[model samples]
Structure formats: C-alpha cells, structure tokens
Target chain A: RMKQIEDKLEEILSKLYHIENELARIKKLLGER
Target chain B: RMKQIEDKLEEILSKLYHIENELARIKKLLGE
Candidate 1:
C-alpha cells in the first residue's frame, strides 16, 4: 500500500551519502545524468 | 468497488518501466 519513490534527474535524492548504498554501481548515475 | 493500487515502498516496484502497468492491474484486486 505504499510506493518507494524514485526521483527524476536532478530531483530529490533524499540523502547524498546514502547514494552509495542505494546504487549498486556509480555508472547508473550516468544514465540519469 | 475498484480501487487503483499503489506499489509498496521497497517491497515491490520490480521491473523498471513497468511499474505503472502493474499498478493498474492491482486495482482489480482491491478489497471492499
């Protein structure tokens, strides 16, 4: 009954530090950017 | 009554681009 939010490019990532934990690969960011 | 469903927060949301499609189907399974 809930949704894990996904942000758009340059959108709210919530935590800058947590980005590493959230993404398995940093290359994934390239796709969004 | 049918209610459109919401994806779980971290529990579901599998399939990158198909989330919207799955959400539509869940509406048919609503209770009440």
Candidate 2:
C-alpha cells in the first residue's frame, strides 16, 4: 500500500522549498516594504 | 488527553481546493 506512493520526496520537497521561499517573498513584499 | 483521531480534512479541504484552484484560474485568466 505504501509503495503505491512514489519515493519522490526529492522533487516534492524541492517544490515545497520553492513555495516556502515564494511565500516568504510575498510576506516581505507585503510587510517590510 | 486526545480525541483519538479523525480525518478532519474534508471540511477545510474544499476551502483549500477553492483557494488553489482559484489562484490557478486567476493566473490563467490573467495571462497564459
């Protein structure tokens, strides 16, 4: 059942990192401006 | 002291789905 999920956290985590960075960017753009 | 667990996802999920899907829809509606 577990193997039904991909062992692809690398891509997922990288995209998650990108999203975190973008959210931070948005907050900064809206905040410390 | 816990209420054990439950999939409390479905309720908030439609709200989240609408947010993400609306973002995508607006992005496309704004550009390509």
Candidate 3:
C-alpha cells in the first residue's frame, strides 16, 4: 500500500512538473506577444 | 512532521486548482 501511494505521488509529481513547465512556456509566449 | 507535510500538500493543491482554472480561462480567451 505504501508503494502504491508512493507511485501515485510520483505520478502527481510528474504532472506537477509538466504543468509547471507548460505554464512557463505559455507565459513566455504571452510575453513575447 | 505530518502536519507540516499535509499543510504543504494543501498549499500545492490550492495552487494546482488555481492553475487549472487559469489555464482554462486562458484557453477560452485564446479561443475567442
């Protein structure tokens, strides 16, 4: 169960990082415009 | 401790929801 929880947390972490990068990219595009 | 971790998680959750809504708004603006 702990392992499963850790796996889910890792997945969420991955999603968080993806969103962080995506948000940065979008902000940069807006800034360029 | 556990409380601190939970607090941080809640903060992150808030930020996540904020970003989710913000992204939807931006997409709508771009769409229009």
Candidate 4:
C-alpha cells in the first residue's frame, strides 16, 4: 500500500512538473511577444 | 515559435489528461 501510494505520488509530481514546464514556456513565449 | 508553442500547449493538455485519470484512479482506490 505504501509503495503504491508512493508511486502514485511520484506520478502526480511528474505530471505537475510537465505542467509547470509548459506554463513557464508559455509565459516566456508570451512575454517576448 | 508558433508551432513550438502549439506543441507545448498540447503537451500541457496531455499532462493534465493523465493527471485527471490518476486522480480518478486514486479516488476510486481510496474510496473503496
């Protein structure tokens, strides 16, 4: 159970990381224009 | 740049979609 939750947490973190990267990219791209 | 941004936007959508599925799975697993 612990391992499963941990894995899920990591998955969520990875998703959040991707989202953050996109947000940063968009922000920078918009800022330049 | 436009295409790059479009790709990134799609990437963001894919990530969000995955996250949504994960949340649904977690909720079902935890609730049951």
Tens-digit lDDT track for model 3 on A1-33? 756755666677678878867886886676567
- The CAPRI quality class of candidate 2 comes to incorrect
Q: Which digits, one per residue and each the tens of the lDDT, describe model 2 over residues B1-32?
A: 11111123333344554555655575465442
Question: What count of clashes does model 4 give?
Answer: 0
TM-score (all chains, Cα) for each model: 0.23, 0.41, 0.56, 0.52
Per-residue accuracy of model 3 over B1-32 as CA lDDT, tens digit each: 45755765786697688688668766765774
Per-residue lDDT of model 1, residues A1-33, tens digit only: 122233321122333234433343334544555
Please report the candidate that would top lDDT against the real structure. 3
| Candidate 4 CAPRI assessment class | incorrect
Best by TM-score: 3
What's the TM-score of chain B for every model shown? 0.33, 0.48, 0.80, 0.80
Docking class of 1: incorrect
In model 3, where do residues sit more than 4 Å from their true spots?
B1-8, B14-32
Candidate 2 clash pair list: none
Can you give the lDDT of residue B23 in candidate 3? 81
Which model scores highest in DockQ?
A: 3
On a 0 to 1 DockQ scale, where is model 3?
0.21
True contacts kept of 2: 0.00
Q: Report the lDDT tens digits of candidate 1 across residue range B1-32.
A: 11132323223333322543443454344320
